[PDB]
Symmetry: C5
Subunit: 211 residues, 5 copies
């Protein structure tokens, strides 16, 4: 039923509307969120040399694939709110504060008009299109670019990240370009800071393209 | 009478103000939304070579024509609400999440200040101007460009798309440029992905222009 | 008295706050809106060749002058509401949905922080600065540009447009540039479309400039 | 006391929250606002030739200094509200609709996150940073640029403007550039328009720089 | 407990919600806010010569680190509010109006989507990424740039600023560029203004890079 589906959304989102979206998505014991992160390359927009040196600015279009469990967005799918999945705006719920650290701008831009899909068991899946602008090295007909992602404020004991389907590389399921990928690897690291306290989880991708 | 027109709109939008705009537009049994889609080209803004390769970024001006039925927005066209149609802002109703997938930016931009028209039988007509920026091949005095459109999170079970007026082509009813058109064809496909389960309707246009 | 003037505005705008700003500005019998339209050129920002052909993109600074009657905004100018006119934001009332159809971008941009003035008889005068970007033909040291304006959704029986002061030309009352104007003509047309039924009013300007 | 300072602000702003920010800032008899206006040049971002002619677009960074009396924002500075001044957001109060008339863009951009200061007598001081883009004449190694400011809708009987400290010149208290200034002049004018009936006050600046 | 954390946030923010974010963060006796400021360079986006002179515009990506005590955001960390710290959006609490004075645009842009952390003793820590655009001198293969920061409206008796960790220099804990740093120093100044009354705290950084 269509009414129940909307009443169900209002039901789940009501917590977030009354207490806000800030803070880890647990009402009971505060646990650890495990984010599944995937990066699917679509195309290169431009590679522009910085000055007359061997660095350059690479602008890419990609799809950022995110998944996590939100304890607050749970229901039992039995009459009449008997659905396995529901569509929700990412601006109406908690979302990981995942940033592109080495962004040449403030951050990557994600299309937040892109809806997320919430399952009965609380598993959120959010797959926004994305624009990424980073500093590359352009030397000997090769453009090598790094991409660095992680939660800004949450440590490993609060937000953790692992590669989707444990593939430590740029995914090519959405690839639509003609460029030759010379190199494609990634890495999960736990990094400590002179500014802060604990370890933080960062996914570091390395991409190299034939120029 | 202008009061009744406004009262009508308010009473129709009551449901959306209470339950939100997310989710398929049905209150009773949840069906399948069928969107009629039309791409009307107006003009080329620019075509810029990417680096010194054979690809380029094409930036276009177009009119995107969309129609579908919204069961929630139905009335009895008899006094004092004898109106055939009513004008609505698309930010007050559900709209299909149709994106330009091969967008070199986050997505195409639609002018969402453009008003939609809704008839008494729940048929919605929305015709927003649009800006489209896609990757083209520029070779042999011809520029070939592709436009890929589809609902982002909805499968063919939920949102289906068909060419408006069975015309599988870029429409030229708003054409205002001086460029020579060499190829113009489109295709409705059903696509599966490794991220997802079911089939997704994508509309793929091919446009080639004399450089 | 300043309070009363503020309270008048509140009483006038109460209808729009409660009923919405969509729909023609009549609360009794629904009539036709007659819009007076004036385009006053201020200056040329740039004219840039598109590729290596005869076409170019011209970006203009202008003042768009608009006047219409809003029945909802009328009042009897007797104490304590003895004001001949009042200033209001155009985001708080109905405004005609007039677009620059042949814009190379989504549309022209009007400055909507610019206040409108409303007279006690309901006449609205709104004169927002505007940026317009169109395709031009640059050939033989002459740049020829067109501007095409119209209500997007309302036909001639709903929203009519006429040149302000019956001057079928780009107005030069705000002109402050050094360019030599070589041609300056305009025409009001009633245009029929494929997608739609009735006739739509379009104001079409031709402006030629010494390159 | 910190608490009382916030209560006072809430109490002062209550009038604008109920009645709105539109309209001259008087609750008793409507008088004349006399805006004190200063333009303080910081630096030149760029001067770029338009086409191959003698005009160019000058983009400047400046501080716009504004001051006026808002009789609605007055209080008596004795306990528990014994403050000589209070900080307020300019988007919470009436501000003069002062535009850069000869902007090449829609208008100058003022930074409206910048707080204003109100003294207990109702005098408002607001000093936002600003970006200004205008037509210049670039000839004989001199760049001559004009700046024209005024209230868009209010005549001299409603909003007057005078040079801050009666300095008819671009002010150099914030000047941080290395450019040679060759002429720095200004004039306050009462201008009569055809669209309108009374006189409007315009501040006109001439600034010439060594190219 | 997760719910208890959200309720704590709602309790802390109620003051700001009922009373507003404007004004120094004290509910009792108004005192001085002492801000710790750190500037961490990440990379150079670009440096573009202005005209054909010895100046240029440098565009930098950095991390701005701010810390200060907000007396309003204090709680006793005993059950059931036994949390040492909580994340809060910076648009929900007072933040110092610290500006990049010598910005070539309106201001530096800070990523305000970035959450701040508040500890139970009222200490706020906020570390937004930032883009900074300033005037530089490009001479003898050296690009020398200045950065000037301070509170816009608050004097030394209201908002003070000191170098975070007493490091009077640009910090390199986030530095991801390949550029050679020639000069790196900074200085806390107390500056009296002619437009105004008291003394203002400004942080002035000097950075020279190899071209
Ligand atoms: C308020 O609480 C904060 C958070 O603990 C204190 O910040 C600490 O500062 C000390 C001195 O440098 C550091 O050694 C600690 O590591 C900091 N704490 C953390 C967890 O980051 C701050 O000092 C406290 N202020 C007081 C004492 O009132
Ligand atoms: C409202 O109060 C303010 C503050 O007292 C007055 O502004 C000051 O005026 C004195 C004397 O003219 C000057 O020396 C100061 O420079 C002013 N302070 C600032 C920073 O503006 C103001 O004149 C009063 N307004 C009126 C209309 O009397
Ligand atoms: O340790 C006390 C507070 C801790 C949570 C702090 C924080 C706030 N903002 C940014 C932070 O950066 C952590 C690393 C750097 C990028 N992730 C930490
Ligand atoms: O497979 C189960 C969930 C299904 C709804 C999912 C989804 C969420 N976000 C984006 C999606 O993309 C679908 C196709 C690929 C691009 N459109 C799917
Ligand atoms: O008769 C069917 C509805 C009619 C009102 C429709 C409509 C909606 N959006 C845009 C429209 O365009 C009309 C002309 C072309 C641009 N103005 C029409
Ligand atoms: O004649 C009475 C109306 C008067 C207030 C009108 C108005 C509205 N919008 C813009 C206006 O321009 C006035 C001059 C030109 C720019 N300042 C006037
Ligand atoms: O002196 C009385 C008022 C004082 C608070 C004023 C103010 C308002 N806006 C900006 C200001 O600038 C102060 C210096 C210049 C940059 N910081 C001051
Ligand atoms: C929740 O549902 C999704 C898809 O239905 C499934 O992949 C996921 O494992 C489920 N969560 C659990 C652990 O039951
Ligand atoms: C609803 O109305 C429009 C125009 O009145 C028409 O084109 C459409 O087919 C109608 N739908 C049905 C099923 O009657
Ligand atoms: C309404 O009043 C104004 C001010 O006198 C006048 O100029 C305008 O023409 C009037 N409108 C009509 C439609 O008569």
């Amino acid at each position: 039923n269509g009414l129940m589906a909307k009443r169900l959304r209002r039901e789940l989102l009501n917590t977030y509307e009354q207490l806000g979206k800030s803070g880890l998505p647990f009402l009971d014991d505060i646990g650890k969120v495990d984010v599944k992160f995937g990066l699917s390359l679509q195309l290169l927009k431009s590679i522009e040399q910085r000055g007359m040196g061997f660095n350059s600015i690479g602008t890419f279009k990609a799809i950022v694939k995110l998944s996590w469990v939100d304890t607050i967005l749970r229901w039992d799918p039995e009459p009449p709110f008997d659905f396995q999945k529901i569509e929700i705006s990412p601006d109406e719920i908690w979302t990981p504060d995942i940033k592109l650290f080495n962004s040449v701008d403030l951050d990557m831009t994600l299309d937040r008009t892109t809806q997320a899909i919430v399952f009965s068991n609380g598993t959120v899946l959010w797959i926004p299109p994305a624009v990424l602008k980073v500093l590359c090295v352009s030397q000997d007909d090769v453009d090598s670019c790094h991409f660095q992602f992680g939660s800004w404020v949450y440590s490993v004991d609060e937000v953790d990240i692992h590669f989707m389907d444990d593939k430590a590389e740029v995914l090519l399921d959405f690839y639509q370009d003609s460029l030759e990928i010379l190199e494609n690897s990634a890495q999960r690291q736990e990094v400590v800071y002179p500014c802060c306290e604990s370890a933080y989880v960062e996914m570091k991708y390395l991409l190299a393209l034939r120029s």
